[PDB]
Amino acid sequence: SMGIHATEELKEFFAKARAGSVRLIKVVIEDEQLVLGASQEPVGRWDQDYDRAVLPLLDAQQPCYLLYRLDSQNAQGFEWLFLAWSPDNSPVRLKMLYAATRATVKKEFGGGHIKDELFGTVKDDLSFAGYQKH
Ligand SMILES: [Zn+2]
Ligand SMILES: [Zn+2]
Ligand SMILES: [Zn+2]
Numbered sequence: 001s002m003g004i005h006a007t008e009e010l011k012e013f014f015a016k017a018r019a020g021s022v023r024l025i026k027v028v029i030e031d032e033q034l035v036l037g038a039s040q041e042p043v044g045r046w047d048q049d050y051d052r053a054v055l056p057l058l059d060a061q062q063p064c065y066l067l068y069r070l071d072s073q074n075a076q077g078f079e080w081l082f083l084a085w086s087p088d089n090s091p092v093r094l095k096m097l098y099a100a101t102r103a104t105v106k107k108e109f110g111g112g113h114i115k116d117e118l119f120g121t122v123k124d125d126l127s128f129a130g131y132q133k134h
Pocket of ligand 2: 072073074079115
C-alpha cells in the first residue's frame, strides 16, 4: 500500500530480537521504508542498561522509535517498551512521517509483546527518570 512498510529484514530482526540477546532496537525510516538503525545486547538488568542504551541514540533533530526490552516475560515472550521520539527541532515533514508511521511499527512488531508506550520530545521524557514517572 501507500504507507511506509517494514522491510522483510527488519521483520526478521524483530523475530530474532524476541528470541533473546537484544536489549534495544532502534527503528528509523530510510528511503520510504522502516529499517534497523541500531541494536544492542543486554549487559545487566533492564534498569541498569536503560539510560546508557536509550539516551545516546536520541538525535536532537530527528524522530525515531525504540523498542526497549524489559527482563519480564508474559505468556507470549519478553515484554517491551515502545518509545516514540519526536523532538520539536525536527523538520515538520519528518515529524509527520514518523507520527503517521508509528502504528505500523507497533503492528509489525506485535502489540501483544509491548507492555507500555511512551513519548518524548526532550531526552528527559524518555530517560529512566521519565519511565519511572510514567
Ligand atoms: Zn505498499
Ligand atoms: Zn506483564
Ligand atoms: Zn503507559
